[PDB]
Each structure stands twice: as C-alpha cells, then as structure tokens.
Design a protein around this ligand. Structure first.
Ligand SMILES: *[C@@H]1O[C@H](CO)[C@@H](O[C@@H]2O[C@H](CO)[C@@H](O)[C@H](O)[C@H]2NC(C)=O)[C@H](O)[C@H]1NC(C)=O
Ligand SMILES: *[C@@H]1O[C@H](CO)[C@@H](O[C@@H]2O[C@H](CO)[C@@H](O)[C@H](O)[C@H]2NC(C)=O)[C@H](O)[C@H]1NC(C)=O
Ligand SMILES: *[C@@H]1O[C@H](CO)[C@@H](O[C@@H]2O[C@H](CO)[C@@H](O)[C@H](O)[C@H]2NC(C)=O)[C@H](O)[C@H]1NC(C)=O
Ligand SMILES: *[C@@H]1O[C@H](CO)[C@@H](O[C@@H]2O[C@H](CO)[C@@H](O)[C@H](O)[C@H]2NC(C)=O)[C@H](O)[C@H]1NC(C)=O
Ligand SMILES: *[C@@H]1O[C@H](CO)[C@@H](O[C@@H]2O[C@H](CO)[C@@H](O)[C@H](O)[C@H]2NC(C)=O)[C@H](O)[C@H]1NC(C)=O
Lengths: 344, 344, 344, 344, 344
C-alpha cells in the first residue's frame, strides 16, 4: 500500500473537500476538546513581579469526522510537524500569558496523531510566564494559590467547548521539587467562562497551592531578631554607674533592629497592608526601644538629690522587676504570635 | 450552500475586484474607525525607567461596503487568522510604544468577523510597555497620570479618523488590582491630533489615574525616621556628667538618619527638584543634628570656671527648656507637614 | 480610472523596465538623499554602559525619475508597506547602532508616497540604542555630547550622498523632558565622511548637548558630606578630659565619610582619572581625618609631666586656634571649588 | 560526471520516491540513532535560578538505506544547509531545555554528509540553558551533579532508539575550565526511558560532576568570621574596671557576625534546610554571644557588697578559666567540623 | 548595454550552470579565503560572565572563476543584498560565539562586489559576545588577553583555508577608547587549526591585549585601606588610662577593614586562588588587628600589682617602640609589594 504521508495527502487535498479553516461538525453541535497538561518544570516564582514560569506539555483531543479512514490498515497516522498548517486546530490561549513561546530546537516540538474514528491527539511543548496575584497578609505562613486558565480566542461557547479529561487532568513530573515552596497534590479544576461584548467564550482552569517553607525565614530573620532582644536584656545585669555600658548597649541594639527590618522587605512587593513579618519586626523593635527607656528612668531617678539612699533603692527596685518582667512579656507574646499564625 | 471559507474567497478574489491596499469609501468620505480596549493585566510600573507594562485587547470596528453580502444566509463570517493578510485593516500604532509585541501561542491571537452590512470587527491581543512621565513633587502623596495614545501612521485626517465608542470605551478586568497603586474608575478620553510636516494624523488617547498606597512608605521610612528623632530626645534625661552617654547617643542617631535618607532614594529617578519625602528626611535630620548641638552648648557652659554654681544652674536651665521645646517643635511640624500634603 | 494600487503595479512591473536593484540616475550623477529625524522619546542614558536609547522617525527624500507619472490625475500615491520590497531605497544605517529594531505592531510602521515628479518620501519608526563616550572629568558639572551618525553601507560617495534638509533637520517632540538632563536647543549638524579600504562612504551626523541637573547630587552627596565635616567641628567645643567623647566623635565621622565616598561611585564607569566629585570627597575626608589628628596633638601635650599648668595652657591654645581655623579653611576651599567648576 | 548537488537532487526528488516525512526502515525494525556531544563552553551556573548554560556540538548518526548510492564515484556527499529540509532527521530534544537556540551567523551552523552505504552524519551547534536541582546540604563542600537528557518527541521506542556511541560519547574542549567548579573526567552515561499516556519514548542522558573550589569561601567567609571570634577573646585580657572597654568590644563583635551571616546567603536559593555554612555562622555566633555573657557574670559578681575581697577573687577566677576554656572549645569544634565535612 | 542587475542574472541563472551549493575550484585545489576585521565598538567586558561584546565589519575575499566576465565594460558589479542567497559564500563562524546576531535595520547590512577576474569581496556587520578566560592572579596589575577565532564549520582543510591578509588584518576605529582598559597596538595573528573526529578544519585567530587602568582601584580600595591603617596608628599617641579611647579606636578600624575587604570582591568571579588585591587587604587587615593586640599587651602589663612604677615604665617602653616600628614595617611592605607587581 501507499505510505501514510501520501495517504494523508489524499485525506487533506483538494479532493474530498477538506478545509483547515472550518471546524468539525460545522453547522451542528459544538466541538468538545478535552485537555490535560504535564508540568515538566515549575518555579522561579518572582514575588515583586508576581509571576511564575512553567514548562508544560499541552495535550488536546477532539474528534474530526472528516478524518475517519478505513482503507489504510493500521490504526494511527502521525502527521509530520511541517504539515500541521493544513488541518483544523483549536485556538487555545492562556488568559494570563505575560509572554510565552514555543520550543523549536532540532524539530518543532509538536506531535499529532489521528485514529481511525477521527480522534486527533495534539501535544505541544510550551513555556509560560504566568501571572498570579500574591496575597501576603501572613507572609512566611501563607498558602499561595497561583492558577492558569485556558480560553478560546475566536470560537464562542456554541462552537467550541473546553473540558478537562477525567483521567488525570494535571500530571506533574516525578522529581519536581521547589526551593521555596511545596506543591500540594490536590489541584482544583473548575470553569472560568468569560463574557465579553463579543460573545461568551469557553475557559477551564487549574489551581495550584504553594505552601512555603518555614526553615529559611527562621534562619535569616526570626532567630537573629530574637537574639538582639536578648542582647538588650543583658543591660539589666550591668551596673548602673557604668553609664556608657548600659547606654552603649541600648544605642546599638535599637539601630540594628532598624537594619534587620529594612532588610526584611528587600525582595518583596511594596504592599500597603501590614504582614506577619512586619508585626514581628515592630514588636521586637518595641522591646529594644523600651530597654533604653528603662535606663532613662534609672538615670533620672538615681540622679535625684536620706534623699540619697532612698532613690537609689527605688532605682534598684525598677531593675529587679525588669529582669523578670521583660522576658516574661516577650514569652507571652511568642505564645500569642505563633498560635495566631498556626490557627490560620 | 458552499461553506463560509469558500464563500469568503469569492468575496476577496480577483473576481469582484477587491483589493487589500485600498481603503473603504475611496475617493470619498474618510473611514470612521471606532475603538475600545480591554485591560487584562496592568502593572510593573517602573519609576526609574518611567514606563509601565499593560496587556490589552484592541477592538476596532469600521465599515467596508465592498464586504456586504446577501446570498449567504447567516449573519456573520469569521475570517481565519491565516487569511488576515488579504483585507484592509487600519494602521493603528501607539505613539509611546517603547517596544511591543503580539501573542502568537497555539494560534495568532487575532479575531475578525464581518456582518452582512459590511461591519468588520477586529480584535487582537497586544502587550505594550508604554512610556509616561512621572511628576514626583510630592512623592508618596501623588496621583500619577500615565496615558496611552493610538495614532494613524500612514493615513491622514481626510482619509481615516479614530473615535472611541460611546459604549464603554475602556473596560478593565474584574480582579485587576495593583500592589503599589489603585486605578480610579473615571478615565479621561480626549483627542490628541498630531501635526507634522507630512500631514495631520488622527489620534485618540485615554488617561489613567494611579493614586498610590500610603501604607508601605509609612512602615519603611516615616515611622523608623520618627523613632530615631525620639531616640535623640532621651539624651536630655541622661546626666550631664555622663559625657560618652550623651555624645555617644548624639553621634549614632545623626548618622543613621544619613543612612535612612540614602536608602530613601534607592529606587527612584535622579530628579533635581526636592520632593515631599526629601523635605521629611531633611527636617528630621535637622532635629537629630540639633540634639547634639544642644550638648555642645551644655558642655561649653558647664565647663566655665560663685562662678561654679552659677553656670551649672544655667546649663540646667537649657535642659529643662529643651525637654519641652523639641517635642513641641516636632509636633507642630507634623501639623504643618501632613496638612500641606493632604490639601494638595 | 483604475485605482492607485493597480496604477502603481504598472509603474513597477516587468513592463516599463523598473528594477528595484538599480539606483536612480544610474551611470550618471549621484543620488541626493535628504534626511531629517523626529525624536519621539529620549533617555535611559546609562553611564556604565555608555549608551542611550532613542526613538525616532527617520524621513528620507530622494528623486526617482523612473517614477514620474502624468496619466493619473492626483498628486501623490501612497505605496502600501507590504509592497515596499519592490522599489529602490537607500541603505542607510547607523555607525554606532549597538542594537536596533523596527516597530511592527498592528502594521509595519512604514510610510512611502510618490509625487508626480518622482519625489519619494520614506518615513519609518526606529528604536536605537546608540553608543556615546562619556567625558567625566567634572562629573556633576559636565555637558555630555552624545551623537548619532547616518552612513551608507554599500554605495560610495560617487553614487549616493546624504544631506540634512535646510528646513528643520532635527525636530524634537513637545513634551520631551529628561529626568537627569536637559537637551539644548542648538544641535550641531556636520559631516562625518568615512574612508575605508573599500571606498569612501557618505555620512551625516547630529550632536546633542546634555547638560545635567545639579539638584540631585546636592541632596545625596554634597550636603550630607558637608554636615559630617560640621559634625567633626563640634569636637572642639567638648572638654578635653572627656576622652571617649572627642575620640568617639572623631572615629565615627572619619569612617562614615569612607562610606559616603564608596557610595559616591556606585553607578559609574570605572574611569582612571579623578573627577570633580572625587576631589570633593577627598578634601572633605581630609578635614575629618585632621579633626582626629588635632586631638592626638591635644592628648599628647596635655599628658606631659609649673610643668603641669604650662602645657595645659598650651593645649588650650591649640583649641582656640582650631575653632577659628578649620571653618575658615573649609570656607575658602568652597570658594576655590565652586568657582573652578563654574568657570569651566 | 554531474556535480554532487545535482546528483543528490535525483536522490531526493519525486523520482525514486524519497519522502522526508517517513523514517528509514519503515514498517520494520526501529531506527538506531547513535549520538555524542562536544562541550565547547560551560558555565554561568546560577544557583538561585538552578540552571547552567552550555554550548555543544550535537552529532547524530543513523542509516538511511534509501540514500545508498553507487553510481557517483566518491565516498561522501555534503548536503548544503539550505537543503536540509528535504531529508529525514530525528526529532531529538532536551527534556530540561528552559530555553535554547541555534547559531545562525554567516551560515546556519549545520552539517550533514552521506556515505555510500547510507550512513548519515548530522552535526549542529546548540546553546542550551539546562535545568538542574541543587542539593546544598553541605554547601561549600558539595559535589553538584547536573545532567542533560536527550529524548524523542514524536517517535516511540518501537520506531526510534537513541544510543550513545562507544567511542567517546562526551568530549570536552581542551582549555575548558570553570571559575567556581571543576569538571570530573568520569561521566555517567545511562538510560532515562520515559513513560507517558501517549507511549514510551527513548531517552539517554549524561551526568556531570562539579566539585567546587574551597579557596573562595575561605577568604570571604571562613577566615573573617574566625577573626571576629578571636576579636572577642581579647576582652578577657582587658581590666574589669574598664567597663566600656569590655562591653564595647562585646557589643560590636556580636553584631558584625550578624552582618557576616546576612551576607553569607546573599547569592543563594532560599532553601529551608540548614547547610554547612549555616552551622558555621551559628556556632561562631554562639562564641561571640557568650563572650558578652561572660562579662555579665563578671559585672554581677564583682558588684556584690571580707565580702569585698571575696567576690573580686571569685570574678578573677572566672576570667582565668575563660582565657583557657574558650579557645579550647573553639579548637575542638574545628576538629569536629572539618572532619565531618571531609569524611562526607 | 543591459543593466548590471540583469547581466548578473545571466551569470547566476540556469544557463551557464552556476550552482550556489558548490565551492569554486571544485575537485581541485582548496579555496583560499583571505579575511580582515574592523572593530567599530569594543567593551562591556564583564568579568563575572567572562565575556566581552564587540562590533566588527567582517571582510572576506575569495576567487570564484565561474564569475569571471568580459562582455560588460565596467570593473565591478555590486550584488544586491536580497540576491545574496544565490552565490557561494564561506561558512565562517566563531568558535567562542556565546550568542551573536546580524544588523538588519533599514537594509540588511551586507555588501558584495565582483571584479572582472572573479574576485569576490563580501563585508558584513556582526555583533559578537565573545568568551574569554580571565587570569586574575594579579588583578589590578594584569594584562588580559581575550581572543577571537574564525573557523570553518562544514568544509575541511582540503577544501577551504582561511588566511589573514598581509595588509592590515585588524583595523581599529579611530576614537575607540575603553573606560577600564587600553588596547595595545600589537595584535598577535596566529593559526588555531582544529582536529575533530569529523575531519580537520581551518581556523585563524587574533589576540587582543587589554592592560588595565591603575587609577580607579587606587581611589576606591588602595588609598582608603591605607588611611584606616594610619587611623590605627594614632592609638599610640593616646593616653593609656583612656581605656575606651584606645580600645574604641581599635574596635572600629579592624571591622571597617572587613567591610572594605568584603566590598573589594563585589564585582568579581569567585576564583579560588588568591589575587594581588587579596594579599593587600589581608596584610592591611593584619596591621589593624595587631594594633589592638598591642593594647592587650599594654593593659595586661600596666595592671600588674616598686612593682607599680616598674611595669608602668615597661608598658611605656612597648609604646615608644611601636610608634617607630609599625610605620616602619608598613613602609617596607609597600616596597616589597609594589616592586613585586611592577617586575611582573
Ligand atoms: C459536546 O458535549 C456536550 C455534552 O456532552 C453535548 O451536548 C449535549 O449532548 C446531548 C446528547 O448529544 C444532548 O441531549 C444535549 O441537548 C446537548 N446539550 C447540552 C447543553 O447538554 C454535545 O452533543 C457534544 N457535541 C459533540 C460533537 O460531541
Ligand atoms: C465619518 O464621520 C464624520 C462624522 O460623522 C462624517 O463627516 C460628516 O458627515 C455629515 C453627514 O454625512 C456631513 O454633514 C459633514 O459635512 C461631514 N463632515 C464633518 C467635518 O462634520 C463622515 O460622513 C463619516 N464618514 C463615513 C464613511 O461614515
Ligand atoms: C546632487 O548634489 C550635487 C550638489 O548639488 C550635484 O553635484 C553638482 O551639480 C552641479 C550642477 O548639476 C555641477 O555644476 C557640479 O559639477 C556637481 N558636482 C559637485 C562636486 O559640485 C549633483 O548634480 C546632484 N545630483 C542630482 C541627481 O541631483
Ligand atoms: C537497532 O538496534 C537493536 C539492537 O541492536 C536491534 O534489535 C535487535 O536486533 C537483533 C538482530 O537484528 C535481533 O535478534 C533482536 O531480536 C532485535 N531486538 C532486541 C530487543 O534485541 C535492531 O535490529 C536494530 N535495528 C536496525 C535497523 O539496525
Ligand atoms: C591556496 O593556497 C595555497 C598556498 O598558496 C596553494 O597551495 C600550494 O600552491 C602551490 C602552487 O600552486 C603548490 O606548489 C603547492 O603544492 C600547494 N600546496 C601546499 C601545501 O603548499 C593553493 O594552490 C592555493 N589554491 C588556490 C585555488 O589558489
């Protein structure tokens, strides 16, 4: 028999009246395209830009009854990617593209095969830089949901309908891990049907849940800010007459916490609302700012001028309380802080 | 009947004399193109570069009387995006492009449909990086107006006229929020008709008002600069004989305010005029620079050599005034500062 | 009559012998192309990279006597930008391109029209990233001259000659302002004719003068460096017996000036020669380095061991002179500094 | 005889029935493509992005029995790179591309030659930016394995099989050195055969082992952090009555180690787990944080109020122990640290 | 006579049997291509990336005896750049490309002319980003040699041979200066013939010597590090009883030298070996680290407890020696340092 590249020329030629500009089942029911993706790579989730780069295999399946054959004996005909400009393909796009491209190295990374009953599989490799909004109300303790949605650009709902297939609509590669996040196994698959002044267009989307990793932000921000608070607590065990010792400790710790807070938001969007790392670096700034205000009460009362042995005993009393009080208030703040951002 | 891709070949072929290089109503009245956009994405408003990236759907509508049909029974004919190089389309462009591109993934994201009376809708997806000048005279308290304008490149006013449509000339997507800005709902739609030595060309434009968000700049700059001013005020409650205590406080606060002011303009254009954050960081620098000049008056008068008990009582007098004076002057500055940048 | 797109096919076809590979007036006098540009955008003048991005309209006018018509009644024929590959156009390029591109969004932004006597106007929109050398001998006080030059790549001087037109050879858009510079209205238009081993080629160029803005560099560098010098002057009003007060002031100011000088050259090319901001940050470093060397003369003479009451009166004498001397030397330096970089 | 470009037209023409859309040995055994690469350049191994750029020559060899010739006398026919779109080539791609491109300057950098028995060599130049996961559990002491894998996109295992050749499957250029790494000479060549819902596809891969260089991280991080620990040890040789001397040393060293640790992770991914440089900068932070806690035990016991001469002799005892103890504990930590990250 | 674009069609047509896929002198001696470049721009020499961007005119000359003409009277025929796909051109490429592109603005910047004896000149404009390894053993005092090499991709040595022409093989533009380097006038022109498993291929290369500029690195690094060493020398002129004065000077200078050394390698590759700026910043760190170890010997001996007047006179002796010793050791280090990196 004649080879499949020549048999498939007679199935697309001027004979038999095939036209690549006309959808299947024309002037009839709409075209039911069923889709699933395969995430090869994932990551580079920039939070200033609020986008993320992904690398997928987009598989599409529809039924073209004009491509049904019975003369050729075998069961599938792979169409060459040079000849893909000659059959009908759906005009899928991404409603949050922000730039995308094809992979064309050593061959156009495209694939198409046609069954005997006209079922057409069409798999392509796409790199996307998808946009997603970042809710950062509790920034190291959040679950970021970044989505991707697949619309039709030119065919309306009465012509072309997208669906996810019921057999694994999103697969993920095996060794796909992320440096800052983890990807939860449940993926929300729902509809996102759009309405414009043109018509109404089909849309399907898939949610991805990205829980962060606590372990990085503990090392850089939570633990060193917790040591500077303890570094202000050793002022109370220093003699009151050593005036540049207790002041010189209180000067430096209250201005390194300003440095630790200025570097806390170096790689973030400039959001207006206050986030959970900002309510840590402000309360921890409040303890080291009050550790120098304690000595301003010591140095004012102990300099009052028996009137001498009274106020020195009173300024001794404010130091015996503050050695017990300030680690007790910082301890009950950590109880109210970490429980609040674990219950949420 | 014959399918619409073959009917529309007879409407564009050598028969009937259609030519894609000739405007409609040729040697007659000009072509009235009516336009509206649909902002999908918005943002990445860089202020050093003074540009902003947007992602729109550009819809254009005109009337080509050579495309009026009556034989084919239905009411609209979608032209395939491979065959868009064969009818007349307006040569719209953006007068402040700074780079732009099309979206061509899985299909050229283009759309065209023709009514029975020759009305041609033409919608395309464009990514723009539009230039806009930044007026930063009151930088955290400003309303930035960045525009976009749509000109004709080759047809003059007596051939082609752009208009906004009266039914929603700029729509914005539903969940379109910005991290640093808010987009006001009123959009100024006016004309921008250009005059060159070639001819005069049509132009329409749309203003977008971007009020900022106060909440970010309070956390990073206004509040920590306000604490260092209070950190210089606790010098007055420290004994005068503790010379490295009052000097060592005044040294450090006056040089961290130089650090807080150098980081205040890290992500800005290098504008010449003074802005509202620069008149904050200079007056707040003036208080901490005068808090060390106060002790230079203390340490000079208290070292004069009853002549002993006189000048110590005089140097005590300058400290009792300055504990009341300096928070009173900083309080009446905040009244004159925030009212001035709220009335404007 | 037949429409202009069909009339102009007969003027470019195989009939009448038109050939797009042959210059006008062939085997005769050279082709006189007259040019002018129109600067839409200007800026992003990077000084590390030593380049600047511009966005122009390049208009070219020449006379092709093979395009003279008299049958068609009207006076200009706009050629469609799809058909621009069929007439002769000059091979202009930029001798300092460093990358450039066309604008092709919604139409190739090109324009061509032909008069009855064969005059051909040809306007295109180009984005350029032009290279220019930066003379930075007096860096905030300089006038940077960055040019652009327009050569012929394949035709020599005996075939093709470029000229500027005498009627406004460089226009600038109305609202074109720069954040760091101002553009002077006089533009030097001169010839730049090149000689190679191939032949000699035509060239025209245009100089642009970019005077800077003083106001930015005063706020970030000149004023805060001037306050740290005054911050070292308050050491002389502090008692000599307060040894960590006068030393602790002199330590910190001499090492923040090293920080202010290291940040003074953060966004600059690594030029070898010394510039006017470097001779400011070195003399201002010399005052704060001598303010601690003054106390090293105080603390050595006042510790000599009537021999006691003599050297204390001598160390008092070196402080009464230096309270008058050091602001007097810094005042006469500012006279010699700002006059030198105003006369130049 | 006729020249080889005309002889090879008769071997690819409509005569003899050659078709570039049909694999060799069709309806028979699969195609055995044998491959080897040649690494020209290597490097720019970004660790935040977790990728690396490489520049290779990809050679492929297969046997097409339809290209066997015997009339033409010579032994190889170089096909011109303009005519490479007319014979069958394998659809190899890289499963971890992350962007790639061809080299097309002065000629498409492609090469193909055909032997008399139909052996087809096909060498091309490709630039790849390959993705690889970074295991950073022991960050300056690790061996990073970054791979590259070569799959088939459209042909399954029963049609096309990739193999490495047994004669030097990966060559490396002679002067190919790396700034941060060394490339080990043994390269693991194994199979990576993929299974999808489409079919099963061939895959071969090559592992590259990149041992780092110790010498950079010693200079920037290990040695200066080791000097600040010694800088805290000289507190014990300073008198106890010099209260701003021993405190003022302990303040500054414990907050420069926070600076040295914040800069230790400036160019890294934000991994959660703790790495070997993080357990250095935390133990070295523990010594300088305990060097100030030692004086808090000195300044509390020496201020107790023979009761005077007792506790001063006891506070002398805690200083004689700590001059021997703290360099002894830091010495036995370096034994347990460097042996642990040398045995692994 | 017929015009040259039509005469040259008969010299490339199906008549006369010209074929653009066959080299000149086929089945004969190899093709002797002679080459020379013309450097327009040079620079952006990134040292982290270890590459440099250049902009050249690549001229190639060979002899095609099939292009010899005698009927047409004139002496050169310029081929239009649209018709360059129809004659034979060498497949030159760059063995260290790392990305390159053509210049195609307003015309493809290409040029070809044919003499009567068949000599073909072919000049094109190319932008290259060429890779070169950086030897940084003596980093501010080095001569960097970065090369560029021009190979053949498809023709072996028995088919095509590259040569430099003997008349100025590398010209440089007149005003071509560099911000960080100077380009020496002698350029080493040698052969680089490659051997692969395919065949042996021709190669020619050109070395460029880039001596740096000393003047930048003196201002930022050598001079401010030399002032901090002098800033530690003024400790010896301060009284021994002023304990926070001599310690507080020694604390700050030894930790700003760590800052000056951390910023010394901010824009460098992470090389393992020690370089000449690293042996400066380590010896200068050794002087300021020993200036605080000197007072640790003072404060231990002067606190020993005639036994009182003995050790104070001994601690006075260690200060009289160190005022002479430490500037004498730093002076003889500068003799051994600058002579060593001037003799090399
Ligand atoms: C595409 O999918 C939908 C859902 O299966 C089909 O639409 C329905 O099909 C059934 C039976 O054919 C009808 O009873 C319904 O009236 C149809 N409409 C709705 C809204 O449910 C449709 O037939 C499918 N089209 C093709 C070509 O397969
Ligand atoms: C395009 O729009 C303008 C405005 O509607 C039209 O120009 C005017 O049309 C009316 C009636 O046709 C005339 O009375 C005016 O003299 C026209 N000119 C001006 C300046 O107002 C124009 O007719 C429209 N052209 C088309 C093809 O619709
Ligand atoms: C192009 O411009 C130049 C200058 O106008 C012309 O060259 C001169 O033309 C005049 C009169 O035609 C002659 O007297 C001169 O001898 C010409 N040469 C020089 C060097 O001055 C030239 O004619 C113009 N060519 C065209 C086609 O317009
Ligand atoms: C491609 O490679 C494989 C391995 O050499 C070949 O497959 C085997 O070939 C031998 C002999 O031809 C048979 O005994 C085996 O049954 C084959 N299959 C397996 C799984 O081992 C194959 O013949 C080669 N094909 C070509 C065209 O060379
Ligand atoms: C290309 O260049 C080389 C060197 O000039 C030529 O090769 C030699 O040419 C001379 C005389 O023609 C012979 O004596 C030698 O035997 C040749 N080979 C060698 C290795 O020296 C060659 O002829 C030139 N080819 C062309 C077409 O000009």
């Amino acid at each position: 028999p004649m080879p499949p590249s020549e048999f498939l020329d007679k199935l697309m030629g001027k004979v038999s009246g095939y036209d690549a500009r006309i959808r299947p089942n024309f002037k009839g029911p709409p075209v039911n395209v069923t889709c699933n993706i395969f995430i090869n790579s994932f990551g580079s989730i920039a939070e200033t830009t609020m986008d993320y780069r992904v690398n997928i295999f987009l598989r599409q399946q529809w039924n073209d009854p004009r491509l049904a054959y019975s003369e050729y004996p075998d069961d599938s005909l792979d169409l060459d990617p040079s000849m893909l400009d000659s059959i009908w393909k759906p005009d899928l796009f991404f409603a949050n593209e922000k730039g995308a491209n094809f992979h064309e190295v050593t061959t156009d990374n495209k694939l198409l095969r046609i069954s005997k009953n006209g079922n057409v599989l069409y798999s392509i490799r796409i790199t996307l830089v998808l946009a997603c909004p970042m809710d950062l109300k509790n920034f190291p303790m959040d679950v970021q949901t970044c989505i991707m949605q697949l619309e039709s650009f030119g065919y309306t709902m009465n012509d072309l309908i997208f669906e996810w297939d019921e057999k694994g609509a999103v697969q993920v590669a095996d060794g796909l891990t992320l440096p800052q996040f983890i990807l939860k196994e449940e993926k929300d698959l729902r509809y996102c049907t759009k309405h414009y002044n043109t018509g109404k267009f089909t849309c399907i989307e898939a949610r991805f849940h990205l829980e962060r990793q606590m372990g990085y932000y503990l090392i850089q921000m939570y633990i060193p800010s917790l040591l500077i608070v303890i570094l202000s607590w050793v002022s109370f065990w220093i003699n009151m007459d050593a005036a540049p010792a207790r002041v010189g400790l209180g000067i430096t710790t209250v201005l390194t916490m300003t440095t630790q807070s200025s570097g806390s938001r170096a790689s973030l969007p400039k959001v207006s609302y206050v986030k959970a790392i900002d309510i840590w670096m402000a309360v921890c700034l409040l303890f080291v700012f009050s550790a120098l205000l304690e000595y301003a009460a010591v140095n004012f009362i102990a300099r009052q001028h028996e009137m001498r042995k009274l106020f020195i005993s009173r300024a001794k009393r404010i130091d015996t309380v503050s050695r017990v009080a300030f680690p007790l208030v910082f301890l009950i703040f950590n109880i109210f802080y970490w429980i609040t951002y674990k219950i949420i």
